[PDB]
Design a protein around this ligand. Sequence first.
Ligand SMILES: Nc1ncnc2c1ncn2[C@@H]1O[C@H](COP(=O)(O)OP(=O)(O)O)[C@@H](O)[C@H]1O
Ligand SMILES: Nc1ncnc2c1ncn2[C@@H]1O[C@H](COP(=O)(O)OP(=O)(O)O)[C@@H](O)[C@H]1O
Ligand SMILES: [Mg+2]
Ligand SMILES: [Mg+2]
Lengths: 276, 276
Amino acid sequence: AMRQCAIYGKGGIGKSTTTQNLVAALAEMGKKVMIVGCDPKADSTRLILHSKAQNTIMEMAAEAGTVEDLELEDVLKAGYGGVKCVESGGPEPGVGCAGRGVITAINFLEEEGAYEDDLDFVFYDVLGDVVCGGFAMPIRENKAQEIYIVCSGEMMAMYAANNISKGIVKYANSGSVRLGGLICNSRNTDREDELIIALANKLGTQMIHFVPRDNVVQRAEIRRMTVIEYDPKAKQADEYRALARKVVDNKLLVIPNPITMDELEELLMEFGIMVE
Amino acid sequence: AMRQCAIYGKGGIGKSTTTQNLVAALAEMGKKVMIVGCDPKADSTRLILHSKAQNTIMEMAAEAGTVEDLELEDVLKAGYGGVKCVESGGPEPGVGCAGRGVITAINFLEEEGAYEDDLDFVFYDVLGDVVCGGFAMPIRENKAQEIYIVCSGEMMAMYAANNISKGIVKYANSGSVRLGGLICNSRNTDREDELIIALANKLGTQMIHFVPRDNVVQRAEIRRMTVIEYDPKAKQADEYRALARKVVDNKLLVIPNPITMDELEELLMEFGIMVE
Ligand SMILES: Nc1ncnc2c1ncn2[C@@H]1O[C@H](COP(=O)(O)OP(=O)(O)O)[C@@H](O)[C@H]1O
Ligand SMILES: Nc1ncnc2c1ncn2[C@@H]1O[C@H](COP(=O)(O)OP(=O)(O)O)[C@@H](O)[C@H]1O
Ligand SMILES: [Mg+2]
Ligand SMILES: [Mg+2]
């Protein structure tokens, strides 16, 4: 068995930092993991690979001729802890559908046998500001059974979590895509943990971990590493280890209950976020 | 003549707050303005209308039968300062292309004569996290000649500005869509103004205004108003008046020079943003 997990959330919320650090912690534990980057920014694997980024399947297929001319062994790259990494890529801005590369990439990985029995986890790192095209494909086509949404007390981030939840509900009649939890990536605001707990309860899920804001992240990323590798003794490293443990142990996978904008605004008002 | 302007930027960066306040300031000056919401969040006009939000063209067309059964006089709503407001709407998450409603809305407004000679400005408030489908249509189809990108010292916000700039370049062979400036919506970080000035210079544009972070925004929005209407004497009101004046006076409209990720990272390093 392997658990197929997707990390969604609005742009800049911390998807790639959280995913790569969570996955590093999983590898530290002895799990075999593959990360599939599904965001056109295409830097979802650089902290595992110690790299600027990673050349994308779309780029490599164009240089090879067709995606069929690509070999999996040429595409997947292994970094920290043996974690395997691939990037989908996507068309340039203003050219065709921004998510088109996700479809190409996931189909290529499936056809070429990338989902080997020995894997314990696959994590897709997916752009979540729109839920359509290739960005909806992991949900629509039943590729990621466990969705974890990174958010924060920011209204836009909670709105994005609600939108992603609506996409999960839309496809609940087939497949088995479920909401696994919210991950609060802290903005250092008061009662933010309570706010995301309350949001999760309304959606029917849980807040699986509160990730503190910690500058060690920036120092590790300047050096192209996860915090796990950069400073295994850092407090923030233990935070990512706690998140990884709870993901491993998680058994709550639900069809969520999306909320109204009135309910979102009520949450914000309640927890005094809108704080000096 | 009327100037057609579009405000782009990543989600949550301040597009709708900046646009509605800038437009309120323009109306305060005696300009006639229409705001066209091109973001599925569909709350781009609520501060002008004193409202929860506004029912969208997609919603209204569905209740009427077809978009042809809609009357412009039933769709456009006027609020503060006589500013006219409309929302595109869009499909629900996981259903079809998130930008499809923008195309329907802009074509409807054009066909039904919404662009009356008496208008001085039209502002489109456009989702900018992907540059495709209906979200690219104001650039691709030459609807907004002046693009202003709201950003901040956040790497994701500068990345979005660069992506939008690439879309402008892609369509520069026809039409007249140009980059008019960057608007820095402050995150209260050190040297942020200098950083966005430097980014603008690299792109070939300017930073037309630095908008401070000010809690008066939240207090005005709780009451469904712009700061301009809520507290005309607020310092932040004068900030939006300064932004509006500079937009009125702006004559620099360029085909931008998108930069590499290396250059973006260099900017971040230079201005010590990555600050305690
Ligand atoms: N917990 C954290 N503490 C400090 N900085 C963080 C944290 N999480 C994310 N960041 C920073 O926020 C920025 C965006 O995070 P990233 O994971 O790239 O977002 P996304 O992938 O959702 O667009 C990065 O500069 C990263 O260093
Ligand atoms: N200059 C500012 N000072 C204080 N709060 C701001 C400022 N600009 C935006 N905000 C707040 O940031 C949030 C997002 O702004 P909004 O304009 O809705 O973003 P977008 O339309 O780009 O998604 C809102 O809660 C708004 O009150
Ligand atoms: Mg990312
Ligand atoms: Mg908005």
